[PDB]
Amino acid sequence: TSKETFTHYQPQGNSDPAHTATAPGGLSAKAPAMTPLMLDTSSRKLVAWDGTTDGAAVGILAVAADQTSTTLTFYKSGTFRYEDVLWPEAASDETKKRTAFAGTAISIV
Question: What is an example of a Pfam family matching this protein?
């Protein structure tokens, strides 16, 4: 419990001391946590990963979310457990998902 601050709120500027991202939510259905997700380019929203799109995974959802989620809290980087991460069946090749975070600061094993 601690809230004390007052400054000219500005829509241009966002930074958190944590190592996670918080999107305004833009899913289309309910999805469990501990899984990779994809970030839109135009709508700039965070939605569950398709499973096919190569290099679509941008981060892993920390807490399960749904299309009704107004805010999604997913990771940004760090070594995560693949044996636990619930990858989408769409992934026909094991190497496909294992390399879904190609380009980001995320490294899964």
Answer: HDPD
Amino acid identity for residue 16 in this structure: D
- Each domain of the chain, given as residue ranges in start order, spans 19-109
User: Edge to edge, what strands does the sheet with 35-39 contain?
Assistant: 20-23, 72-75, 57-61, 35-39, 46-48
Determination technique for this PDB entry?
Answer: NMR
| CA nearest neighbour of 28 among 68, 56, 72 | 68
Q: Under a CB-based contact definition with an 8 Å cutoff, are residues 24 and 14 in contact?
A: no
Within 13 Å of residue 86, how many CA atoms lie on the same side as its CB?
10
Q: Determine the topology of domain 19-109 in CATH.
A: Virus Head Decoration Protein; Chain: A, (2.40.300)
Q: Which residues contact 103 (CB under 8 A, 6 or more apart)?
A: 55
